[PDB]
Amino acid sequence: APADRLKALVDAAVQPVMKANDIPGLAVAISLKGEPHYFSYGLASKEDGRRVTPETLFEIGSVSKTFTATLAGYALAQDKMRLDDRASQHWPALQGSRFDGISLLDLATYTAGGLPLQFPDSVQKDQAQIRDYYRQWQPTYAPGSQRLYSNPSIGLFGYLAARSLGQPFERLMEQQVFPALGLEQTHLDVPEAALAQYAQGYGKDDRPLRVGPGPLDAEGYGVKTSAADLLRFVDANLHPERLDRPWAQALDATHRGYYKVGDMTQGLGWEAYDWPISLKRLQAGNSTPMALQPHRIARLPAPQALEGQRLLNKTGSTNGFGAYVAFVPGRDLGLVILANRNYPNAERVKIAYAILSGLE
Numbered sequence: 090a091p092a093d094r095l096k097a098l099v100d101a102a103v104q105p106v107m108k109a110n111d112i113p114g115l116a117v118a119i120s121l122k123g124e125p126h127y128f129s130y131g132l133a134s135k136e137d138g139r140r141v142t143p144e145t146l147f148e149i150g151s152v153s154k155t156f157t158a159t160l161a162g163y164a165l166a167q168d169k170m171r172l173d174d175r176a177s178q179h180w181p182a183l184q185g186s187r188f189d190g191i192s193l194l195d196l197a198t199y200t201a202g203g204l205p206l207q208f209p210d211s212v213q214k215d216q217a218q219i220r221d222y223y224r225q226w227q228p229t230y231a232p233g234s235q236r237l238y239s240n241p242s243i244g245l246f247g248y249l250a251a252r253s254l255g256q257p258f259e260r261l262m263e264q265q266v267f268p269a270l271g272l273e274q275t276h277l278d279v280p281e282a283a284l285a286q287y288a289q290g291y292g293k294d295d296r297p298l299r300v301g302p303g304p305l306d307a308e309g310y311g312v313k314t315s316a317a318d319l320l321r322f323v324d325a326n327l328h329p330e331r332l333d334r335p336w337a338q339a340l341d342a343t344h345r346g347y348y349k350v351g352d353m354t355q356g357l358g359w360e361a362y363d364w365p366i367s368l369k370r371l372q373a374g375n376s377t378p379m380a381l382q383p384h385r386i387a388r389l390p391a392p393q394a395l396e397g398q399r400l401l402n403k404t405g406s407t408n409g410f411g412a413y414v415a416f417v418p419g420r421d422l423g424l425v426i427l428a429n430r431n432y433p434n435a436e437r438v439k440i441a442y443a444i445l446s447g448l449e
């Protein structure tokens with residue numbers, strides 16, 4: 090009976106949304122009172138008929154920001170940086186720039202003063218171009234005052250966290266972070282031996298789309314992972330105490346809220362809501378206006394623990410893919426939804442809300 094009821098709940102949430110958004114393939118993974126449950130739908134590749142499984146690799150886009158935040162949490166645990174550091178402390182090229190007056194916290198939480206959603210098209214994936222972009226950038230408004238969701242912002246946060254540890258960002262993730270979290274199916278650069286698992290992404294007229302190189306891509310949006318590995322990461326977030334102590338502290342650093350915008354409390358990577366909350370309010374917090382427009386923040390007088398009666402979440406998108414992760418610390422409940430079409434955030438949240446409501 091229980092396996093039949095859980096399958097009926099997840100199918101009822103997923104199937105109409107896959108049909109309505111023409112999603113070729115979708116993987117669900119659920120952590121429920123310490124047990125994993127997987128539901129796999131459709132095709133990883135339409136052309137070769139490869140089916141989605143819990144081992145299929147998807148692009149998770151900005152869910153990568155929670156991994157970037159975890160690396161910064163490790164640098165914090167090691168006393169190699171502090172969130173109140175000026176950004177230019179960690180990169181001499183930025184000395185004398187406006188990054189002398191911008192904190193690592195500002196970069197991590199998109200409050201540096203109007204760093205845009207993307208690097209401009211004039212900035213290619215090239216160390217000198219990225220360096221020169223930051224050297225010349227000037228805030229539109231005071232650092233710390235307005236949230237503008239931004240790849241160059243948290244990208245530079247990750248880049249500087251890696252500099253504080255004295256190694257390149259991609260090497261630290263591969264050699265230290267993924268192994269510490271027990272993640273063997275999680276990649277910034279998918280090995281040749283694993284390419285057979287890499288789903289195709291789909292856009293307009295089913296154009297094939299896998300993410301191409303971009304400036305600070307690894308830090309902002311570069312992770313490819315399976316539903317099973319991403320649920321292992323959610324389970325690490327639900328139980329940091331099970332990891333070796335520096336890594337427990339690194340995860341805990343991603344569960345601290347600094348300010349509110351509407352119903353959302355901003356952490357490092359994770360965004361949190363009170364739980365329960367209406368589906369419409371969870372959709373609104375993950376809406377296009379929240380992501381694309383500047384919002385004045387309401388700063389907390391001290392950092393707030395993102396635990397208990399809360400939902401922590403993150404959306405992630407690339408041209409071909411749409412991911413969503415959510416978990417409820419105080420209920421030991423976690424959810425991953427990975428798809429190979431970039432379909433609306435509101436639809437991702439609709440699936441998740443139906444599942445989380447029915448596990449409740």
Ligand SMILES: *[B]([O])([O])[C][N]C(=O)/C(=N\OC([C])([C])C([O])=O)C1=[C]SC([N])=N1
Pocket residue numbers: 149150151152206238240310380381404405406407408431
């Ligand atoms: B992340 O996945 O949130 C980073 N997102 C992006 O770079 C892109 N869109 O950003 C918005 C519109 C905020 C979103 O909802 O993801 C992006 C990259 S390629 C593409 N089609 N969209």
